[PDB]
Symmetry: C3
Subunit: 403 residues, 3 copies
């Protein structure tokens, strides 16, 4: 294709001894054989620049899990190929000109014994570095036992060992229980992807540093996360459009000194944003939050099991700045839990020194813009509603009502 | 080029029955023939993954409108090829080493009755999904009757059918009356494009959902729009650099629960930002606004017909938050209209519950930072200027002057 | 590879009469020969659409400086190939599977008399236009006399003449004294790059207009700048993750009407953000600032020579809005300079009309959240700390303490 042995076309690669295996029959087997060829040629720590695996547009079955254990592997297609399998699965499709996702289309047909399509893992040293996934489609094909479960035990990309400077861009993920998992992410960029109709979209697990999640379209399922970060420092979440129907849109546990700025959040359940287990010194600013109710009939009675006192934002931690956000709450009074409750927009569930400043709230019913738990200390609430919209169970909250 | 029938090189493709037609002579005919080949091979609703059309760098004439009616079509070049035809058309080009745009360079030479270079449209179902335009140049070549009219009736890309997950990235648009139009956009991304010296840059028409317009350079002409959205819900506009000389830089009509955050706006006329016809619950925050005067001699006496009482931001609708913006106004007193008037920076033209908070204004003349129309109800103006810079003709506006 | 003479593969291109000069031995010489071939074929101002130079993954030595003097040259690899040479140089690498960066990997081995790998420069008109550098790695290989000096006199990309619509995206820069310098930038985009372990990351010198620096990961060295801009107008800095250890993370000199919004800033020294020499009318909003101390043993005793009274933000100029930011200051008393001093978070060193509004500061010791020099005029401090945390030596500062 190019005059370099480090450029692979999955549609041109023949597996020695298995002449019937094609990218169409098992792209997993073809890419593992390509990686074996890389490891054969690149055999010292000063001769391992990696390679690019090109996936032309087409339909490819993946039966065999790909183990990515080399630095600077690029897996690159020519399109994210996103298609709403959720709408297809729930309407009359008579006369429809297309019935599945496309582009550089990998159908994830992994067994339960190796359920991640791409397992990015190296035992040993150093951190896996500079791996790129871009411009292709990972499709779990079906949920179990029906299209509305958001369950199938399949993962698109699982990075399971400490990693540096990974770049996930221009991807499409659809109908995976877990689209993308990255554990121990250092200097990760999840940028300009379509991650929708997955049980869970992006899970940043274990710990992380200096990460950017930007310019993504994401929608998850009601038992799953849209974006989750665990023990991240300096994660920046910006320019994302998060839409239903994750249990949450943004969930941090033990994340400190992170920034969630300039995003759009639309959810159908309480607890769209959760800062859990002592999140400290986070900036939650310049975001648009819309709490609505489900319009799509197959999900109308589906819930994340939380009531409207949980908060649109539910925060437990110290010295977070929740500022300069707009909250638009519109839930029919008969869909509010418990019956006759004032919904909570921002709940300070616990912690010291949290500051809520310049937030504009619109609701169709009487709401508490801010509730602060009895355990909250040295809280500040400025210009985020009339006195009558701010509930401090804590005796020491300083409150400036909107004039 | 690759071992897939779904990868096309426009410079290698021969049209059966028209053997002398090349990408150089009519790339539109070549791409139409390629799309016919895709539809011949991809002949069932479960065998349509689409294809990539590759445009090497070069000068290509497009005479025949391309009709894109297949899902997951990627059209990709290797460069946006942007060149200022505006400077070229208006100065002495003696000894100039280049006189036109380049990269993957499509000269748009469409007939007046089929003027859009790319018409993206399908009659039937489902929505066209996952189409990608990237990394090429669409050039309208000339404006008529002269280079400064911003008129030629040509469009770069016109999406005229309901669409899902379209991605427009790394493009160059120049000297088109309309660069990009997208009707009924759902989960659209207009990302990291150069759209400049077009009459109109980006028109998001009809209605839309869950769209991101991010990281673009845009500049339009005095009778057209830079970014227009009509009846959008959850549109996120972030990281854009909007420069002159559109009639407006951002124009929303009937848009609700949208966000315009972390952009740079430079305009030479009033009405740089317009929220029109009852826009509700939009966040307008963390933007830099610069109102100046035309410095390029060919356009010095051009106007958009609006006076300085119209506003840098003109807002008509309910419950918008306009916060944490900087406005730098510098217009020679002789060019301010009406004669001797104080320019208006933010005009609330009408609507209920709008909040203006924490805005810094600089002006070379005495200005009203905020004017509220008499018809505005339950408005708040916080820390957006001294009492002498806020005019509320509405009697129920709550004003906290900057201390 | 494709049926166009404007598509070059550096691994396929042979220099006629120099068969020993390959991409591997001197990719500089190869690309210079490709540019001579472009110039020979594209011989008139109406036949210069430019070309693409494709860099497959591999290890390539660059001994000869590349002179880019043609419009619409795209130089494109398949991977940024980033690897921490800094960690590699300072820890036990026994059993390490990789010891250097990779991807589309250019080892910069330039002579001291032509030290920039890529010099983008043209004498004559018009401005160089539409040049693209994407998806490859520029590696300076070593700092001298040891890995921790940040010194080698090498530059990755130096744009030395006036330019329009340049695009730098998906790049990796490592172990260069200067990664990227762009003089006289007009409509430049530095987007989604990895620029780390360089003495200086991005220097926007001379003057500039309408530029975007977005979605980058950047880390410099203690004598150098992360992002520098000189006399820029309408620069937008957004979505970036700036980490240590530059002298500063953002340094503006004489920049006016620019915007720094929705970024993450982590530094180990005072003066993380500097608005120097009369910066006017800039927006600094919705940013996360973290001032910490060096944790990586090899750099523990390194400093940028400034004391803790300099400021996390140091501003000298008029009418800047510094609002809606979070500052997390944690420096052990034994590392504060001078010993026993009260650190300053935001210093207004001078100028007229600066506004500081809605800033949340956390500090491990008592700090002055805001200090205004005696020379400051018409300053506003709103909701950026209790009265005991704001010090105005200027008599005309209006202060509203946080309630
Ligand atoms: O909530 C987001 C979440 O839901 C998913 C599906 O599980 O996305 C659903 C989506 O639309 C829901 C909505 O419409 C469904 C509908 O169709 C669409 O197709 C139309 C025809 O061209 C488009 O014009 C329209 O814009 C599309 O939304 O399906 C039926 C026909 O197939 C129509 O009756 C519907 O219009 O359902 C309610 C019904 O009132 C509407 O408000 C929605 O448009 O959700 C968003 C909008 O809420 C949209 O992007 C999706 O299509 C999943 O992808 C997400 O995770
Ligand atoms: O003094 C700063 C100094 O200490 C270091 C670590 O030695 O960092 C601590 C840190 O937090 C200080 C902070 O919280 C302390 C602590 O508080 C929890 O318990 C309180 C019960 O009294 C609750 O009120 C509070 O909500 C809980 O978070 O938090 C730690 C758990 O992470 C526990 O070790 C403590 O018990 O002190 C006050 C409360 O007293 C809070 O406002 C702070 O969060 O200091 C910085 C803030 O300056 C913060 O990042 C750290 O976690 C060291 O690095 C510092 O130099
Ligand atoms: O307002 C943006 C809008 O206008 C367009 C043109 O229709 O962009 C023009 C632009 O600059 C206007 C400005 O400069 C014009 C001038 O400078 C250009 O050319 C020089 C040499 O080729 C370059 O060195 C310089 O950087 C260019 O800007 O062009 C003429 C001929 O070269 C010179 O006489 C000018 O100096 O006009 C005045 C000076 O007359 C300056 O204040 C301007 O810079 O607008 C922006 C800056 O305002 C800049 O990026 C553009 O070049 C169009 O592209 C936009 O939609
Ligand atoms: O009570 C909420 C409940 O109603 C639903 C629709 O059944 O949504 C309405 C909505 O808006 C409420 C809001 O505006 C009402 C209305 O106002 C227009 O007319 C007024 C009188 O001339 C003007 O003062 C105002 O500026 C106009 O916008 O808007 C409707 C059309 O969109 C008209 O039919 C109404 O007359 O009520 C007050 C004004 O009384 C405004 O602040 C509101 O915008 O409710 C939500 C906000 O809570 C908003 O998104 C909706 O448009 C239903 O969905 C809700 O549960
Ligand atoms: O309406 C604001 C608008 O007016 C201008 C003048 O057209 O500013 C008026 C304003 O400032 C006056 C002031 O400006 C300093 C000046 O130079 C600074 O910047 C240079 C780099 O760009 C440095 O080399 C120099 O050392 C700096 O002092 O700023 C301009 C360029 O930005 C230069 O033209 C100026 O020389 O002049 C005095 C010095 O005499 C300074 O203290 C001021 O900063 O006037 C009021 C104060 O009365 C102030 O609020 C305004 O900024 C224009 O620059 C503005 O955009
Ligand atoms: O400050 C940024 C600046 O420093 C550079 C190096 O010059 O980046 C360093 C970095 O980490 C510093 C840190 O840990 C380094 C350390 O750990 C890494 O490796 C571990 C697995 O081997 C990972 O689990 C961990 O996440 C990595 O940070 O490297 C050594 C070898 O592994 C270990 O001894 C270290 O623990 O140093 C202190 C402790 O010494 C920790 O607090 C830090 O994580 O900083 C960035 C994050 O901004 C991270 O990616 C780097 O590894 C340079 O690249 C930057 O300009
Ligand atoms: O499933 C809902 C039932 O569970 C309870 C707990 O037995 O509600 C849990 C719930 O709301 C609790 C709530 O109240 C607590 O704190 C108050 C102030 O400190 C105190 O007076 C209450 O006695 C105590 O229960 O939390 C907030 C205050 O933080 C308040 O608004 C709530 O009433 O926990 C979630 C919040 O974290 C809510 O979604 C949920 O309702 C019982 O009350 C429910 O019937």
């Amino acid at each position: 294709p190019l005059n370099s042995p480090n450029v692979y076309d999955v549609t041109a690669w023949r597996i020695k001894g298995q002449p019937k295996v094609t990218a169409e029959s098992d792209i997993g087997a073809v890419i593992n054989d390509i990686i074996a060829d890389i490891k054969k040629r690149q055999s010292t720590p000063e001769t391992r620049p990696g390679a690019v695996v090109i996936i032309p547009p087409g339909d490819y079955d993946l039966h065999t899990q790909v183990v990515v254990d080399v630095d600077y592997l690029t897996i690159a297609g020519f399109g994210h190929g996103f298609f709403s399998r959720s709408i297809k699965d729930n309407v009359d499709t008579t006369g429809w000109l297309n019935l599945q996702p496309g582009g550089s289309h990998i159908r994830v047909l992994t067994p339960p014994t190796s359920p991640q399509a791409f397992l990015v893992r190296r035992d040993g040293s150093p951190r896996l570095s500079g791996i790129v996934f871009k411009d292709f489609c990972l499709d779990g094909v079906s949920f179990v036992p029906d299209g509305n479960s958001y369950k199938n035990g399949k993962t698109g990309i699982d990075v399971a060992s400490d990693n540096d400077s990974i770049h996930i861009t221009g991807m499409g993920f659809v109908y995976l229980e877990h689209a993308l998992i990255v554990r121990g992410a250092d200097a990760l960029r999840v940028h300009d992807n379509m991650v929708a109709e997955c049980g869970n979209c992006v899970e940043l697990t274990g710990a992380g540093q200096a990460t950017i999640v930007s310019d993504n379209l994401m929608g998850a399922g009601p038992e799953g996360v849209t974006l989750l970060a665990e023990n991240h420092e300096g994660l920046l979440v910006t320019g994302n459009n998060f839409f239903p129907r994750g249990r949450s849109l943004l969930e941090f546990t033990g994340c400190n000194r992170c920034s969630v700025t300039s995003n759009r959040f639309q959810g159908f359940y309480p607890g769209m944003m959760r800062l859990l287990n002592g999140c400290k010194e986070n900036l939650i600013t310049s975001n648009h939050f819309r709490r609505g109710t489900e319009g799509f009939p197959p999900f109308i009675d589906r819930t994340n099991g939380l009531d409207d006192l949980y908060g649109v934002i539910h925060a437990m931690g110290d010295n977070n700045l929740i500022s300069n956000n707009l909250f638009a709450y519109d839930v029919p009074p008969g869909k509010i839990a418990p019956a006759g409750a004032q919904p909570t927009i921002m709940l300070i569930a616990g912690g010291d020194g949290n500051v809520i400043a310049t937030n504009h709230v619109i609701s169709n019913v009487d709401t508490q813009h801010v509730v602060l738990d009895g355990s909250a200390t040295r809280s500040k609430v400025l210009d985020s509603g009339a006195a009558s919209t701010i509930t401090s169970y804590s005796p020491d909250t300083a409150i400036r009502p909107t004039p």
